[PDB]
Design an enzyme around this catalytic site. Sequence first.
Site, PDB file in Angstrom:
ATOM      1  N   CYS A 195       4.588   1.034   9.333  1.00 20.96           N
ATOM      2  CA  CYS A 195       4.460  -0.308   8.493  1.00 20.96           C
ATOM      3  C   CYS A 195       5.549  -0.538   7.707  1.00 20.96           C
ATOM      4  CB  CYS A 195       3.399   0.446   7.249  1.00 20.96           C
ATOM      5  SG  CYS A 195       1.674   0.229   7.752  1.00 20.96           S
ATOM      6  N   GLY A 233       3.421   5.407   9.794  1.00 20.38           N
ATOM      7  CA  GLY A 233       4.672   5.232   9.452  1.00 20.38           C
ATOM      8  C   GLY A 233       5.546   4.097   9.942  1.00 20.38           C
ATOM      9  N   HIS A 278       1.049  -1.177   0.034  1.00 15.61           N
ATOM     10  CA  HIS A 278       0.047  -0.047  -0.068  1.00 15.61           C
ATOM     11  C   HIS A 278       0.725   1.355  -0.112  1.00 15.61           C
ATOM     12  CE1 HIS A 278       0.599   1.016   4.377  1.00 15.61           C
ATOM     13  NE2 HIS A 278       0.627  -0.316   4.457  1.00 15.61           N
TER      14      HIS A 278
END
EC number: 3.4.19.12
Lengths: 299, 299
Positions: B143, B141, B39
């Site tokens: 991820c 942030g 993503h």
Amino acid sequence: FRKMAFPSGKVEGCMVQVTCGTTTLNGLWLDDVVYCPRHVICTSEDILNPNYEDLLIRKSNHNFLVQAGNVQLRVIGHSMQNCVLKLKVDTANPKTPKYKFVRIQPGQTFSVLACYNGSPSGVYQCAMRPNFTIKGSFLNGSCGSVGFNIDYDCVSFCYMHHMELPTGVHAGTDLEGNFYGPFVDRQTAQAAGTDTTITVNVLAWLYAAVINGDRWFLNRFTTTLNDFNLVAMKYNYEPLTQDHVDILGPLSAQTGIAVLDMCASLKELLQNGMNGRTILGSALLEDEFTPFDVVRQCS
Amino acid sequence: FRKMAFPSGKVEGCMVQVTCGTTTLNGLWLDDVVYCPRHVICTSEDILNPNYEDLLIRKSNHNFLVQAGNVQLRVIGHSMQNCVLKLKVDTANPKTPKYKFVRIQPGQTFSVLACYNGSPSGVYQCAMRPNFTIKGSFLNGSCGSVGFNIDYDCVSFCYMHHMELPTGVHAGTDLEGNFYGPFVDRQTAQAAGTDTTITVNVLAWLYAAVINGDRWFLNRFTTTLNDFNLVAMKYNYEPLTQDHVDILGPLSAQTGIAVLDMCASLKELLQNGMNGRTILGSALLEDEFTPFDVVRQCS
Ligand SMILES: *[C@@H](O)[C@H](C[C@@H]1CCNC1=O)NC(=O)[C@H](CC(C)C)NC(=O)OCc1ccccc1
Ligand SMILES: *[C@H](O)[C@H](C[C@@H]1CCNC1=O)NC(=O)[C@H](CC(C)C)NC(=O)OCc1ccccc1
């Protein structure tokens, strides 16, 4: 909230093993010096009441086996500073981080890299108790493991591990070899003094609750710092210092709750209890999260 | 006895920052490949309902900005494996450890290295819940942060972070890009199935409490495996299997407490409560230590 250790890689690159006789413990290799607990030079006959000065005069550079993994580092000098041995080696450690040696206060937290035979085994957060012990997880061979904080790539070493007390908690020195608390590196029965609750950390936890919307305990009172401290001692809570008030500053600004107003809130919790209500999903007040830990986890 | 994470150094050397358009998150650099959540390619509008293969075919290699420390790595190819993007770069990571990709089972634990902008921030232990969430500590942030176990210097990567549910628990994938649980990498509020307690882990933790000299919860009673499972299921605990009984063998042999005897202890605790008492400092039954975790730490 979670107890979160610092990433340990910068310290891992500094761990070595130090053997003298048949005793192996861990050492910290920074530039061309290895730091380790001085009791490595003890024999089983020396530990009850060691004469460290006399034991060290009988030692030579060639008595010390320092290994990075299985690779020997040649020792070219040795000295003792308080309770730590400093072995000068002929190789500067290329993984030396930017670092400082720091002596921490009770209530402050740090990460421990538990090591055995110079090999890192795990990492976890510890709080220095007001009685200068920590609740560590250490087995035989763990001495020389260090505790640290990391600020902007600079490692502040604050703890080197030396001993376990009869109650299962642990004691050690700063990296200048000065013990935290009234302990000595002898194989003798030493008892941790009566512990207390870390007030500044409980307040940090109440601020963390408020940040997250859990604020039922905010009351309508205030207090002076002296009036609070006198009540805190009656509940086995630590008194607050001027430094404590100041390190609560950022959380006070973020929530708009004055430090002394939060003190008055905690004072009500101490005199009246929680009444089956929870704070942050807990019935107990948590005292091992510092104001920096709270900010660190919320940012 | 504490929640202990693996030393994170071998993973730190693998973290990088991946930027696509206005989105930044972390990637895992192994050999000449960087793994990251797919993503990253989504914009603010795409995220509500993204058609990933369609969005990815419209991207170029130069649309991906990969940074390792200060140096840029050049993307020379890209593919997608389930919810993970595999970015081929022109440089091999010299710090790549011996590693494996594993899909972990519910009830197993791993260490998380939380990272932001490609820089490691903290390390802590998690368990894969039976409902395939994890109770983590993750912010914007985070991820691309990964979970892992370490065995004899071989890192086994089991988790990459993708999202936070509205309840505050976390969801992600294995390194093949397949979610743990019924979750999807779309910007929608998603619920997990009802969580249950990891029974084998509660029992291991009760054994740890005894190895550490605590016994207030033990009793003289015993129970059959099936009778215990009837009560366990009544309190939303997972079933205990014979394989679990066997895995608890060493802990029973060490303390001399039969597994089914400890089950009778837990049954009592479930039916009576803890009555304001604590076990290993906890006021709630702890289920994020596996039998291996207890063994490793205690010996
Ligand atoms: C370091 O190798 C060791 C750390 C102990 C080992 C068990 N858990 C620990 O934290 N330090 C010592 O054994 C220490 C050495 C000098 C200070 C004498 N002595 C000590 O801690 O006395 C208590 C004790 C010794 C051995 C086993 C358990 C407790
Ligand atoms: C990755 O950097 C980020 C993770 C963290 C976890 C804590 N807060 C975060 O932001 N992931 C996301 O933002 C993720 C993106 C999806 C495309 C996977 N979205 C997400 O977690 O959204 C959850 C959500 C969406 C809608 C309503 C309520 C929750």
